[PDB]
Amino acid sequence: ERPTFYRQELNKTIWEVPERYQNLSPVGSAYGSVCAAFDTKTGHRVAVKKLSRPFQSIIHAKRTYRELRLLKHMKHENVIGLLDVFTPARSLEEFNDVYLVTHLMGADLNNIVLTDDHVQFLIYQILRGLKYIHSADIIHRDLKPSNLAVNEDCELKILDFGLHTDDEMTGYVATRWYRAPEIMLNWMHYNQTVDIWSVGCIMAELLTGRTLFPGTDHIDQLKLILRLVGTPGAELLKKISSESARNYIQSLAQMPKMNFANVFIGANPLAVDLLEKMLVLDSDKRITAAQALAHAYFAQYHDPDDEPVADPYDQSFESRDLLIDEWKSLTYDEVISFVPPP
């Protein structure tokens, strides 16, 4: 049953991996270190990630379990999937290290970023993967061009699910430019509609070649957003939980929604229409992924018999309080029960 493992030291780290993985070469590294390799069982080039200190605290142990549960569930053409997971440990008593294996992704959408046909195909694939993700009541939370892998045939996969520090979100940073305003400013309990705001920001940028809302800080970014989509009406104001955030919003002079045909000059009128339905300030009123797939902009690609949904996903663990070793034991069980894809 158990494969043979071999050891080697690569850039100050000991890696112990099954013989099937060959020609390990470092390609990146606080969450872990990553090597590219060739998988002789499948023939794919793969990425192998060795987790750093996976069980050093309750918070870290629960994050390790969360990542493994999510990656084991995702089985969709437009979403990253898990090729393998392994540990050199022979028992729970000696279990300390976790390794995760995926397909090696080449370029992300940044490098690419285009005909209108290209934009149709790229955004279609993002929405097809999001319909699947949202059907399992999962929220990605961090959709942006660097988290979308694209190959030579324009085929796309969503990766790097949100599993973010205050400093990471400060200033003139791409880590904030794609976030929905209700989550950027903690206006209210958010839901899956935050991901659709992100898709609108991405689509606009593929059409113009420019970041839609490149704010120099949170407040500058909010001002850019409200200039395009208008200031809130009383209906949305009621839904903002913070009295102080409500107070700040009402300090701003009122502004009407702009004409999107005069912003996105020359774009396909169907693309302009779809952007007006994604970039809505009130998250209750945004288009959903399932609704967007049926929009006329995607008529060339839409096939309602080839847009699958996910098996149900139990996240009850997220409200559970456990000790370090109880999270560690749950993780061990998930490593040893992994069944590889066909």
Ligand X SMILES: O=C1CC(c2ccccc2)=NN1c1ccccc1
Tell me which residues touch Mg ion (CB under 5 A).
Answer: 146-147, 160
Please tell me whether 32 is known to bind a ligand: yes
Single-letter code of the amino acid located at 130: L
Choice from 22, 23, 96, 216 touching Cl ion (CB under 5 A): 96
Does 141 participate in binding Cl ion (rule CB under 5 A)? Answer: no
- What does the block give as tokens for 318? 């997220």
Residue nearer to ligand X on the CB measure, 100 or 212: 100
Q: Does 168 bind Cl ion (CB under 5 A)?
A: no
Among the candidate windows 26-34, 178-186, 218-226, 265-273, which touches ligand X by CB under 6 A? 26-34
Residue from 17, 68, 70, 100 touching ligand X (CB under 6 A): that is 100
| Cα–Cα dist 180/186, whole Å | 10
* Residues paired with 25 in a beta bridge: 36
- 99 known ligand binder: no
Region from 83-91, 154-162, 269-277, 278-286 binding Cl ion, contact rule CB under 5 A: 83-91
Q: Which does 47 bind (CB under 5 to 8 A by kind): Cl ion, ligand X, Mg ion, none?
A: ligand X
Find the part of the chain contacting ligand X (CB under 6 A) among 27-35, 132-140, 188-196, 241-249.
Answer: 27-35
Q: Which of 39, 97, 160, 325 is catalytic?
A: 160
Report how far Cα 201 is from the mean position of its chain's Cα atoms: 14
For the chain, the residues before each gap (C–N > 2.5 Å) are: 29, 113, 163
- Report whether 28 belongs to an annotated binding site: yes
Q: Of residues 17, 47, 156, 158, which one binds ligand X by CB under 6 A?
A: 47
Count of residues engaged in binding Cl ion, rule: CB under 5 A: 12
CA 34/CA 174 separation, integer angstroms: 23
Within 167-268, where are the H helices? 174-177, 181-184, 193-208, 218-229, 234-238, 243-250, 260-263
Residue type, 160: D
| Amino acid letter, residue 87 | T
Phi, psi of 200 (to 5 degrees): -60, -45
Whether 43 has a binding-site annotation, put simply, is no
Q: At what angle do helices 269-278 and 193-208 cross, to 10 degrees?
A: 150
Is 49 a binder of ligand X (CB under 6 A)? yes
Angle between helical axes of 193-208 and 116-135 (0-180°, round to 10): 170
Is position 92 an interface residue for Cl ion (rule: CB under 5 A)?
A: no
Q: How far is CA 108 from CA 56, 126, 145, 195, in A?
A: 32, 13, 7, 18
Q: Residues 10, 27, 174, 296: which binds Cl ion (CB under 5 A)?
A: 174
Angle at CA 283, nearest 5°, toward 225 and 141? 80
160 as an active site residue: the answer is yes
Site string for Cl ion, 19-38 (x = CB under 5 A): xx------------------
Out of 24, 34, 89, 136, point to the residue binding ligand X (CB under 6 A): 34
Least separation in angstroms between CB 254 and Mg ion: 37
Residue 34 interacts with, from Mg ion, Cl ion, ligand X, none (CB under 5-8 Å by kind): ligand X
Query: What is each CA distance from 122 to 11, 16, 57, 206, 207, in whole angstroms?
Result: 37, 38, 40, 9, 11
Rounded-to-integer distance, Cα 292 and Cα 268, Å: 16
Q: Which stretch binds Cl ion (CB under 5 A): 76-84, 127-135, 169-177, 314-322?
A: 169-177
Task: Work out what residue 18 binds among ligand X, Mg ion, Cl ion, none; the CB cut-off runs from 5 to 8 Å by kind.
Answer: Cl ion
Give which of 90, 85, 7, 5 is closest to 46, Cα–Cα.
85
Handedness of CA 170, 175, 181, 185 (dihedral sign): negative
Q: Name which of ligand X, Cl ion, Mg ion, none residue 174 binds, using a CB cut-off of 5 to 8 Å depending on partner kind.
A: Cl ion
Selection from Cl ion, ligand X, Mg ion, none that 179 binds (CB < 5 to 8 A by kind) is: none
**Annotated catalytic sites, by residue?**
160
Q: Which residues bind ligand X (CB under 6 A)?
A: 27-28, 34, 47, 49, 100, 102
Indicate the annotated binding residues for ATP. Answer: 27-34, 49
